Structure 1
Amino acid sequence: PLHPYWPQHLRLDNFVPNDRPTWHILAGLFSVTGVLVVTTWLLSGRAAVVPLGTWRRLSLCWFAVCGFIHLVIEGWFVLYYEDLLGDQAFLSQLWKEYAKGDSRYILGDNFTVCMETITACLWGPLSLWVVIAFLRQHPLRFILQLVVSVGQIYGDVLYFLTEHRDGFQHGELGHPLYFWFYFVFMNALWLVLPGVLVLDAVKHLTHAQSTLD
């Protein structure tokens, strides 16, 4: 009615629609991610102590991206979820757009705020320590890769179950953009890749423990 979010009966007063077009936000976000991924490729080649494999340099790109997303994008929510509706700022309009796939991000849901606080505070800084560790070949490098990836999967599984328990009321089911892209896909990225990185860290640490015997 006055707003696009779900369920439709919510009385979300103080809401003001996005001032910018939606493509400035998604074009702008794509650039900063692009700059980061390419420069991570440059920084991996130059500043590494040993020649990293191609899939290893890509792995540092993933951790560099996650570090920025948790620290800056999700950090903004944890600070300003109280006044996110009706705010004219780049990150505020990103969340107003994203929250159409899950209205819990505008309502300041108790679980969502607490989960995001841990993600922004821990897995942001630790994602940067994984990147630094692999360049210098520090012994903690595979242990940190495990601790961050396990921490992300646990938060992501709780995210999907708690919504399923409510019955997906915070977003129209089966919608192409708001459901299958915003809710299913980009949340499932932190469910599948990280699972591949858990299997990798286990393999190298299992061999590390076997050689010590």
Structure 2
Amino acid sequence: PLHPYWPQHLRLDNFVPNDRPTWHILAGLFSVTGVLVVTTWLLSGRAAVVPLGTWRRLSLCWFAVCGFIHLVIEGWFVLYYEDLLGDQAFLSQLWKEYAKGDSRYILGDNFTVCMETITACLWGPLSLWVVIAFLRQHPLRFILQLVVSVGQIYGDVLYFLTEHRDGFQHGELGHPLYFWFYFVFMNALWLVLPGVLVLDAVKHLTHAQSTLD
């Protein structure tokens, strides 16, 4: 058909197909984020006021990845959601590819735009501030971790609930790549990893409160 997105009765003008093969885009994102992850591992190795341990370093790598994604990938959507169609910039093509599992990013839905606006403006800088805090053993580190994780979980839950109440019409149900991987799995992370970071922070802050009392 003219366009690949769901529902198929959509009428999208100014749709022009992605020029690059999709694996260019996907592999570029994975390569750059892997470089970011290894660089953050090294940084936590050499730039910590006191040693951190393996799993906290991995948590900082996660927070750096979240900061990059929210500031750049989602920020590009928030800036240019009106012109994702008919554009051949790298991040625009990435969004066009991703939206085949969720067409709300092409339709400019109000809830989506608002949620990604909040995510790009608040949770990205706060995710990087978490890393800065943990490097210097500042206070607020577990507080910021808890706040960011709670916000991410709330946003993802609202996202899933709204798409469910719409009947899963913005994406083909049961398609391996577009439903299970793009829509479910890549979002289920922001339900699972933040959750572990909420149970963890609560364990430490509580131990602090019992120390005062």
TM range (shorter): over 0.9
| Post-superposition CA distance 1:83-138 (Å, at most 9, x none) | 11010100000000000000000000010000000000000100000000001000
Deviation for aligned residue 1:49:
0.8
Secondary structure in structure 1 of the residue aligned to 2:197: helix
Q: CA deviation at 1:64?
A: 0.3
Q: Distance in 1 between matches of 2:143 and 2:69?
A: 22
Q: Aligned partners of 1:117 and 1:180: how far apart in 2?
A: 25
| Aligned equivalent of 1:106 | 106
User: Deviations along 1:140-166, whole A, 9 cap, x unmatched?
Assistant: 111000000001000000000000000
Deviations 1:34-72 (A, max 9, x none): 111000000001110111111010000000000000000
> Which string of whole-angstrom CA distances, capped at 9 and with x for unpartnered residues, describes residues 159-196 of structure 1?
00000000000000000000000000000000110000
Deviation at 1:73, TM superposition (A): 0.1
Structure 2 length-normalised TM: 0.99
The Cα shift of 1:14 comes to 1.0
For residues 60 and 115 of structure 2, what CA distance do their matches in structure 1 show? 24
- Cα deviation, residue 82, structure 1: 0.6
User: How far apart, CA to CA, are the structure 1 residues paired with 2:47 and 2:132?
Assistant: 10
SS of corresponding position for 1:122: helix
Q: 2-side partners of 1:114 and 1:145: how far apart?
A: 22
Partner residue in 1 for 2:68: 68
How far apart are the structure 2 equivalents of 1:13 and 1:52? 52
- The alpha carbon displacement at 1:20 in A equals 0.6
Pairing 1:120–2:120 present: yes
Q: Aligned pairs, how many?
A: 213
Q: CA deviation at 1:79?
A: 0.4
Q: Secondary structure at the match of 2:193?
A: helix
The Cα shift of 1:139 comes to: 1.0
Corresponding residue number in structure 1 for 2:131: 131
- Post-superposition offset of 1:13: 1.2
CA distance in 2, matches of 1:160, 1:139: 33
Rounded Cα–Cα distance in structure 1 between residues aligned with 2:139 and 2:107? 43
**Within 2, Cα distance between the matches of 1:37 and 1:91?**
20
Q: How does the TM-score come out when normalised to structure 1?
A: 0.99
SS in 1 for 2:51: coil
Aligned to 2:37: 37
Q: Secondary structure at the match of 1:168?
A: coil
CA distance in 2, matches of 1:209, 1:37: 33
Work out the CA distance in 2 between the residues paired with 1:98 and 1:212.
48
- Spell out structure 1 runs of 4+ moving beyond 2 A: none
Q: Whole-Å Cα distance in 2 between the matches of residues 153 and 48 of structure 1?
A: 28
**Residue 29 (structure 1) shift:** 0.3
Q: Tell me, in whole angstroms, the C-alpha distance in 1 between the residues paired with 2:96 and 2:139.
A: 42
* Unaligned residue ranges in structure 1 (runs of 5+): none
